[PDB]
């Protein structure tokens, strides 16, 4: 019964919980506003910092965790959003890839828009190099931004989005419950083996990048996480 | 963009928005009680009044819920913990079996333990007859409470235990995440085809169900549901 | 070394180990209800029957105890929350004050606020004529309900709340140290002579009190008290 | 608020939130085996791997925590039960100390006793060189083993103490509460600005040693962790 759990309904530069990388900046309000609106191809990428094992090699065992987080994105002039935000798992060694050039890559991936990672992601920019669909969508990414499943979804500017991912190690489900500021709800799901594509060690947080043309806010509101792992 | 969506922190007899089922009764802290701790085999259920399309045959969509709720059983001398509660979904019309021998049904089954029904159960007594767990544990029945799948959990006599649940359509999902009172999360998913085991317009609510020897506390504290069905 | 240790994880009309004063019940499962909802200026406390020496005239020593209990507070239409609850230690002949107005008072005091006991109060009602902080707070009373000392605290509706409270004899001193639901802690602390503030032989118990306009749900989830005097 | 909050019912190898130092040991039973019982002078701590943030150069606040432990002492033919056990707060670079004699130091200060922390010891050897009360004790440390306050306490062989800590920021005031086997309890408290004895970020752990002679074993069963800084 090994037990991982923290939780933020705000934020504060300098707390040691927190892994900052990129154009990152705490908002006077504890928001968390991960891209640079001056900058191109900004990227910018907030970790739990202390990495969580999600599988014991020892065991066989995979840990299941729920996490809930809230996010918002705002359009500003005279710039198309860009193109969002991903609620990603990497290995504890990960950095903003080499020469990041933003945009489709959401900060996490290479130019060919793949990388080392596990993650959801709220694109509200298509980008036919990586297949992206015609509109805003939610996809789970297994090591590339070309998901491995989508859905329809809307962002809508200056809305709170409130998010709800479910990962149970029985079956291997990544489950996600997106509700929107109307009030519906956006679901997606897809089995994910993360003891075959991640290491033992690995490290939580969301990622946002831009583009020349393309850019926006990017705001992670608050953020709650529980991750138990069976050790039997 | 069908949307039904409903928050009780607390309820109160005379809520037209709940049925009564069984021998159910508000406590004066606004909770719900749901068997009777004096009446041999007692049996209790509580639902949500006006029924939700959970599908459509026109279109052939199916609604995707996110629902969370948070309950108490605690323990009673001279009597075993009987038998658990359980969150389920049936035809508009279910009504508690007729002669329903209480115990490991749930109040959703007959002695046979077959019924017409889905839902989730948090089982404490475990009855051989049933192909039942040896221990307490959580479990997804469909149309049975001889479980299509189960796993390990611990109930906590006098401890306020948290559940979400997510719902989806596409993949057809349903995963629980449990929050047991000392933080460890508990989880179970599994693939059910709503669409093919229940009416287009189904019923949300809570059972639960003594015996004889056994009889404990069971509080359904607070509950908010939210389902989404595509019209197009 | 005479000490005193009950540890009550739930409760029952008539054990003799427990005295109800005013509107105290007992729910189902064993849950202390100190008011009633319908009454004007409602008053409830419960003692524990056997009255505790904190002090000798001997010795001249204090005793230490370490206590910790959970409770509840619960909003309900229409009414403004009110006003709290309170852990004291008075008299062993301590008795509702002879005319209690309910209020602030909290049971404990007489219309100008004052009475012969010390206790750590949660006031979520702010009574300007007994100098109350603008906010819900958590304050150390001492024979008076215009609190020695306070500090900031919000009250959640339907959350188990859980305290912990050590007085060190060698030092006099009192600290208190509450823990949200949400997993943030609170905590004040104060010097308190009890050896000057009470008679060698007490009573410690709960008491909340309510209003006309201003009732609410005060819940005692549990308690568990250990006390400890030398006697060299 | 800026809360972390751990929480540990047992241990094993490969958790990335434990640091061990030392002889550390994990026992299959889930328990931390401090020192070796086969080496002479032997030091072994433990630590929570990520650094928490007491207190802030921008808002000047001190945080407020509390955290409770149980551990376990117990003697062997046929040395004499060294020396004790210790929980104490120390920079994040803290380790132990350069050529430790173990013993008297309790494996966090140098041979003069001296070094960079706040603690709490639960000394079960007296060491004159250090001011040691002739009887086994409990004392409040402030960078040397020679504590700045000190209580009277009997270590019992095999049995379970369960300590709680309380630290008020408001008044720097640090509160412990000793629960011994029999069922009496031990207090004591020290007033200690940690704003002015450590850095911003620090470290905390449990460290126990041993002489040539003298060795005891020194089991730590379960720690819960819990500090709140407000940032505003
Ligand atoms: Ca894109
Ligand atoms: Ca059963
Ligand atoms: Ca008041
Ligand atoms: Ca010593
Ligand atoms: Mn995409
Ligand atoms: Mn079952
Ligand atoms: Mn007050
Ligand atoms: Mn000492």
Same mark, same amino acid.
């Given at each position: 019964?090994?037990?991982?759990?923290?939780?933020?309904?705000?934020?504060?530069?300098?707390?040691?919980?927190?892994?900052?990388? &990129?154009? *990152? @900046?705490?908002?006077?309000?504890?928001?968390?506003?991960?891209?640079?609106?001056?900058?191109?191809?900004?990227?910018?990428?907030?970790?739990?910092?202390?990495?969580?094992?999600?599988?014991?090699?020892?065991?066989?065992?995979?840990?299941?965790?729920?996490?809930?987080?809230?996010?918002?994105?705002?359009?500003?002039?005279?710039?198309?959003?860009?193109?969002?935000?991903?609620?990603?798992?990497?290995?504890?060694?990960?950095?903003?890839?080499?020469?990041?050039?933003?945009? &489709? @890559?959401?900060?996490?991936?290479?130019?060919?828009?793949?990388?080392?990672?596990?993650? *959801?992601?709220?694109?509200?920019?298509?980008?036919?190099?990586?297949?992206?669909?015609? @509109?805003?969508?939610?996809?789970?990414?297994?090591?590339?931004?070309?998901?491995?499943?989508?859905?329809?979804?809307?962002?809508?500017?200056?809305?709170?989005?409130? *998010?709800?991912?479910?990962?149970?190690?029985? @079956?291997?489900?990544?489950? *996600?419950?997106?509700?929107?500021?109307?009030?519906?709800?956006?679901?997606?799901?897809?089995?994910?083996?993360?003891?075959?594509?991640?290491?033992?060690?690995?490290?939580?947080?969301?990622?946002?990048?831009?583009?020349?043309?393309?850019?926006?806010?990017?705001?992670?509101?608050?953020?709650?996480?529980?991750?138990?792992?069976?050790?039997?």
């Amino acid at each position: 019964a090994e037990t991982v759990s923290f939780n933020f309904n705000s934020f504060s530069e300098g707390n040691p919980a927190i892994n900052f990388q &990129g154009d *990152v @900046t705490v908002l006077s309000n504890g928001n968390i506003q991960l891209t640079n609106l001056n900058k191109v191809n900004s990227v910018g990428r907030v970790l739990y910092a202390m990495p969580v094992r999600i599988w014991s090699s020892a065991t066989g065992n995979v840990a299941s965790f729920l996490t809930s987080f809230s996010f918002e994105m705002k359009d500003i002039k005279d710039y198309d959003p860009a193109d969002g935000i991903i609620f990603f798992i990497a290995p504890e060694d990960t950095q903003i890839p080499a020469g990041s050039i933003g945009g &489709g @890559t959401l900060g996490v991936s290479d130019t060919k828009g793949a990388g080392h990672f596990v993650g *959801v992601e709220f694109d509200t920019y298509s980008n036919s190099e990586y297949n992206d669909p015609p @509109t805003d969508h939610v996809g789970i990414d297994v090591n590339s931004v070309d998901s491995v499943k989508t859905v329809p979804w809307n962002s809508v500017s200056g809305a709170v989005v409130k *998010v709800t991912v479910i990962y149970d190690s029985s @079956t291997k489900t990544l489950s *996600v419950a997106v509700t929107n500021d109307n009030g519906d709800i956006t679901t997606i799901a897809q089995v994910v083996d993360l003891k075959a594509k991640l290491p033992e060690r690995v490290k939580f947080g969301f990622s946002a990048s831009g583009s020349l043309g393309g850019r926006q806010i990017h705001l992670i509101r608050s953020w709650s996480f529980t991750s138990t792992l069976i050790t039997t």
